[PDB]
Design a protein around this ligand. Structure first.
Ligand SMILES: [Zn+2]
Length: 71
């Protein structure tokens, strides 16, 4: 399972940044940096604050990885 998730995440990192989610303050979503996960989305740190990103704001691939990556 770990190897499968790593291969999928490698696939995401291989896409152009234009196809990945960016927050209004510039933060690029990275599933490997998820610190908390709920039913509506995930939390990622960004210095002195955390973002919460709803799954629906991510691409389908980004959502899949956000849901399955093991914390
Ligand atoms: Zn931020």
């Amino acid at each position: 399972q770990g190897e499968n998730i790593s291969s999928l995440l490698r696939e995401l990192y291989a896409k152009p940044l234009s196809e990945r989610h960016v927050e209004s303050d510039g933060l690029i979503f990275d599933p490997a940096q998820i610190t908390s996960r709920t039913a509506n989305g995930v939390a990622v740190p960004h210095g002195d604050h955390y973002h919460f990103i709803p799954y629906s704001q991510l691409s389908p691939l980004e959502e899949k990885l956000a849901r399955i990556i093991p914390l």
